[PDB]
Write a structure and sequence with these properties.
monomer; alpha+beta; Translation Initiation Factor Eif1; four-stranded antiparallel β-sheet; 27% helix; elongated; Eukaryotic translation initiation factor 2D; translation; translation re-initiation complex
């Protein structure tokens, strides 16, 4: 199938008491729909829904501790579902899941960024194609480099990339943006919105 990128939420230590009944512990990964279900179940099971307004949840000490701010601790007594749920989601750790065609899903902590393709102008009219953030998608830069050497019939290297430690970029001699289009869009079937820099291609390919 097409590559799948799915947002996830990771349970921090501060929210383990809320998630206890659900069976999830610190470090569990959840989809947003599961979080909603768990929080609604919590409010119901603990009889926290307001008798006179079903849109409202009275906060117990567990909810007060993990989703209220410090300036709200002894002030806000009830929250509507919309606020309660949004707060719960924001307190969880951001994460995501990438499923490349024919592969098992790879889980990642943090927020997804696109693969970034740039052209670097060197020597005399000699360009180099630079490809960054492959690892964010579970792609091995050395494998990508080897594939592109075959595809582009041009020399590839893997080199350190700016930013975080041990980050890598693939460099290909010449202007090869169109071949990255082939590799990422066709071979790995990644959604177009996860790639930056294809607008720099010589030809649509």
């Amino acid at each position: 199938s097409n590559a799948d990128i799915k947002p996830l939420y990771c349970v921090p230590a501060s929210m383990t008491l809320l998630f206890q009944e659900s069976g999830h512990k610190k470090g569990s990964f959840l989809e947003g729909s599961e979080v909603r279900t768990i929080v609604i179940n919590y409010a119901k099971k603990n009889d926290l829904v307001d008798a006179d307004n079903k849109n409202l949840v009275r906060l117990d000490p567990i909810l007060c501790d993990c989703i209220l701010e410090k300036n709200e601790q002894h002030t806000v007594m009830k929250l509507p579902w919309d606020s309660l749920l949004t707060r719960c989601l924001e307190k969880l750790q951001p994460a995501y899941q990438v499923t490349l065609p024919g592969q098992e899903p790879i889980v990642k902590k943090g927020r997804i960024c696109p693969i970034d393709i740039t052209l670097a102008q060197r020597a005399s009219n000699k360009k180099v194609t630079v490809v960054r953030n492959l690892e964010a998608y579970g792609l091995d830069p050395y494998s990508v480099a080897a594939i592109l050497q075959q595809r582009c019939q041009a020399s590839t290297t893997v080199n350190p990339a700016p930013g975080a430690k041990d980050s890598l970029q693939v460099q290909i001699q010449g202007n090869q943006v169109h071949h990255l289009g082939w590799l990422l869009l066709e071979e790995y079937q990644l959604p177009r919105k996860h790639i930056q820099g294809l607008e720099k291609a010589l030809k649509p390919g």
